[PDB]
Subunit: 133 residues, 3 copies
């Protein structure tokens, strides 16, 4: 509909990792969503020190900001994933969760970055998104 | 005018932190500004090893690139903030400075990332921006 | 053609570093390319533990995704560069390689971020791109 996904035969398969190599955006209106973080609406921390749990709250927050603006995850054109003290042992789970975030749609482009810190120590993952309308 | 800001009632309040949860861009022309850095026009370092001081130079540089392209900070649709050896004790100041960067406009979306290094050791903060026209 | 580059006289010269301070995108169709990584089409690692070598594979991958979508590097509006355990001694080489990636076109905007890790330990550099059509 709004976007078209590009996964070249000449490239390694990315969708097992929960992303597409590129998304073409043909629509004009773009929505830029700030980096989301494992906070509820009172700014309380969802998940404790479990990355997997925090990752769910982030996705939920993304989905909610999307909804509020009139979009769904299928409208997402690009993700960026920022993880604190990243360990390859959590990678599978994170890919699974981002893959599931698209609720069956082709996955957007992603970048997976292991950072040193987020805004506050309690924060373990941040995901930002771009979508079209 | 060019952009519309989105801050859901169902989300924690972001504008105290100097960003909005999402910016809708309705214009067609987008301006992509490279990560700015605490350098003056001779590539000399403004600020010494004070993050706060370097952060001012970066904002100034952003504002200047904006001006040169025909835009203002109110036109900014998204920021990304990269901080070296980030400590939560500087967070308040950084939010204050980015908040003030919009000169009264609703703040754009931001992501706050604590990185390991920038291009050179002397560099302590980098902020990139996207805006519309 | 598709994009216009902006390098203010009032700013330090960026093109020696292989980027422009800002790119104006006048076209409507945007292409978002996921962070590319030193993998061939079988997901095998190109480059071993040499950053320079891995950096070539990444650029090649970017160029290929571009080609597949119908674009060239001259169409690139913005790069983001993520480097693991970055050392300023590799900076010159990386700038040279990104500079050459545009095959003579004015270089896009870039951000150079020294990260803690990528998706897997073997990975040493990741570059994502945005382009227009």
């Amino acid at each position: 509909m709004n976007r078209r996904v590009i996964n070249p035969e000449t490239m390694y398969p990315s969708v097992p990792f929960g992303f597409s190599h590129a998304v073409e955006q043909l629509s004009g209106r773009t929505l830029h969503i700030a980096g989301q973080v494992a906070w509820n609406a009172n700014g309380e921390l969802v998940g404790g020190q479990d990355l997997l749990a925090q990752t769910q709250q982030v996705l939920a927050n993304l989905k909610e900001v999307l909804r509020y603006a009139g979009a769904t995850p299928a409208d997402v054109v690009r993700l960026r994933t920022y993880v604190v003290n990243h360990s390859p042992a959590n990678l599978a789970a994170i890919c699974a969760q981002i893959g599931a975030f698209y609720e069956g749609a082709d996955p957007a482009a992603n970048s997976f970055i292991g950072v040193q810190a987020l805004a506050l120590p309690e924060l373990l993952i941040e995901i930002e998104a771009t979508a079209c309308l």
